[PDB]
Ligand binder design. Structure first.
Ligand code: CL
Ligand code: CL
Ligand code: CL
Lengths: 153, 153, 153
């Protein structure tokens, strides 16, 4: 029962996380994390390098918010499909999980292409009747990724 | 418990809806709607225009059935992946929800391409021990879409 | 309740099955099947031919293991997205189900492409407090598929 509850909570979180970004409700995105959080976007191969280079990196909620503010100030259509989560550990109301994802993007030419494929590797805080990310690492396969005014994965 | 029940009902509906179309069981498709229904397929940008042009439009079950009949009479391989649904409102046994989707298509050259990416915006009727669409709007990103003898999204 | 239990078991199985292959934990893959199993990969159109040609075929766990051994001995990045399962029959603790899937692949040029789209047609053994495949047929749309040292779908 407790397993089913955490599974559903995390899968609901991921569905709403994808729709928040795809709908361009970027202001909601930082609220899905705890204040003292970690969000990063790193290439699959870099997750073995001595110095894993993140191409997007936020080590506080303030940095998440800074990104949303900048994206609004210095103003494609995105679509996430996120797989069902695999829970990989439970220590009380802290739950680790992973879920595959693909972000599809449609630009001005009108063709929808695969923009970024990867998997989320997460630590969720399920305390206090809520579901928020303590840490999310987007471990990605696709080489080309936006480096200027990039919308979150 | 009631939330879990509606969530599961809608996610089961979407899984079976995608497989019905992909398997070419087109005769089942109109049965997934109530009689006095609305099905439409509209571009993301048109959902702000003064006159949102739908490229596929049915305002009764009779129109759904008319499409299936025509597709059979005047005879690609499709594959849907549908995200988990986000329930956006509940008024008794009427439930609104949204779910991301991508339809992949394989034509005679054998390459599988992204045909149509979007999100379903739905009103479900969960009354009377059943799950049927009152209305489904497929809000889509991908520019090119079939305009002759188009299979439903 | 029993329906919800089988649904969750199968959807959890599929999530972990995709991640096992994508993570290159190929040694886990044969363990997801019973010993006297059937795994095959067959083109959609061949599922009507008098002699349906399978392009990947294993009729025991020994054959599954033989493939993993060969892949290790004679050494792309893959990403599965698997749809929610539709349960198509239940005879005690043997359950038939189907689920759409797309395997995305990223090769040396760095572009992520659609490698293989299809649906799983499965017979699950849910006896003895466990979830294992009795048979899985991957019925696929995409023409080009690896024929040398192919990683499982
Ligand atoms: Cl920037
Ligand atoms: Cl027509
Ligand atoms: Cl081989």
């Amino acid at each position: 029962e407790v397993a089913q509850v955490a599974q559903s909570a995390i899968d609901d979180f991921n569905a709403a996380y994808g729709l928040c970004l795809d709908d361009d409700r970027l202001e909601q995105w930082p609220t899905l994390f705890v204040d003292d959080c970690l969000y990063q976007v790193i290439a699959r191969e870099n997750v073995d390098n001595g110095l894993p280079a993140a191409v997007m990196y936020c080590d506080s909620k303030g940095m998440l918010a800074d990104r949303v503010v900048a994206l609004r100030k210095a103003n494609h259509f995105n679509r996430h499909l996120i797989g069902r989560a695999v829970i990989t550990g439970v220590e009380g109301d802290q739950v680790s999980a992973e879920a595959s994802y693909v972000v599809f993007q449609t630009r001005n030419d009108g063709e929808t292409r695969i923009y970024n494929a990867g998997k989320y590797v997460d630590r969720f805080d399920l305390s206090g009747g809520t579901v928020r990310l303590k840490s999310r690492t987007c471990i990605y396969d696709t080489l080309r990724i936006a480096t200027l005014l990039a919308t979150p994965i």
